[PDB]
Design a binder for this molecule. Structure first.
Ligand SMILES: *[C@@H]1O[C@H](CO)[C@@H](O[C@@H]2O[C@H](CO)[C@@H](O)[C@H](O)[C@H]2NC(C)=O)[C@H](O)[C@H]1NC(C)=O
Ligand SMILES: *[C@@H]1O[C@H](CO)[C@@H](O[C@@H]2O[C@H](CO)[C@@H](O)[C@H](O)[C@H]2NC(C)=O)[C@H](O)[C@H]1NC(C)=O
Ligand SMILES: *[C@@H]1O[C@H](CO)[C@@H](O)[C@H](O)[C@H]1NC(C)=O
Ligand SMILES: *[C@@H]1O[C@H](CO)[C@@H](O)[C@H](O)[C@H]1NC(C)=O
Lengths: 50, 99
């Protein structure tokens, strides 16, 4: 949860087979004010995620 | 007063001290994992890192690196321990002895 300089046409790109484009949803190389930051781990062999 | 049975509030307990627990949102900056780095730069090409959006204190810092002095300026040394700044920018280099 941050103050993200979000782009106009945001999208992502899978990192097993790289696409033509690149991940461009923010150009924010300024480390902006973040009210929250965290990382969690889940199952890679799971069917669904709720 | 008359004869009778009366109910009187006698003070019995009072809270001694408090317990405080809170889960942190942001992470530890680990300044001392940078100040104890091996490759120390010389006063021509000093480094700088910008520790921002994390949590820190001072006591584990200044006992985990072998301090010889800690002055301050435009500040009071106990005003660190409370407040919440916006970033910290540590710039280190080695010292030539006669200068
Ligand atoms: C959460 O996990 C991601 C991915 O594992 C971390 O992003 C990596 O951060 C390191 C150090 O900054 C970079 O060298 C990698 O290139 C990053 N990977 C990707 C895919 O971006 C991220 O730092 C983790 N966040 C926290 C708070 O630990
Ligand atoms: C001390 O600082 C240097 C930065 O000068 C850190 O060096 C990095 O080491 C990793 C090792 O995998 C390299 O991939 C990076 O490219 C290095 N960074 C740079 C800017 O060259 C070093 O890790 C620091 N020491 C500790 C203990 O964190
Ligand atoms: C994606 O980024 C790389 C590196 O900046 C660049 O070489 C490449 O041309 C970019 N792809 C597109 C479609 O612009
Ligand atoms: C979730 O992970 C466990 C081991 O961590 C594994 O036994 C289980 O098969 C995984 N779930 C699915 C749906 O595969």
């Amino acid at each position: 949860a941050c103050q993200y300089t979000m782009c106009e046409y945001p999208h992502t790109v899978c990192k097993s087979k790289g696409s033509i484009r690149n991940e461009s949803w923010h150009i924010d190389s300024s480390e902006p004010l973040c009210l929250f930051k965290k990382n969690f781990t889940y199952n890679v062999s799971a069917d669904w995620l709720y | 007063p008359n004869t009778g049975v009366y109910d009187l509030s006698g003070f019995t307990v009072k809270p001694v001290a408090t317990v405080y627990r809170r889960i942190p949102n942001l992470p530890d900056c680990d300044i001392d994992n940078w100040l104890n780095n091996v490759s120390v730069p010389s006063p021509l090409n000093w480094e700088r890192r910008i520790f921002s959006n994390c949590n820190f204190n001072l006591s584990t810092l200044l006992r985990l690196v072998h301090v010889d002095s800690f002055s301050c300026n435009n500040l009071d040394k106990s005003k660190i321990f409370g407040s919440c700044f916006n970033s910290i920018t540590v710039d280190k280099f080695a010292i030539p002895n006669r200068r």
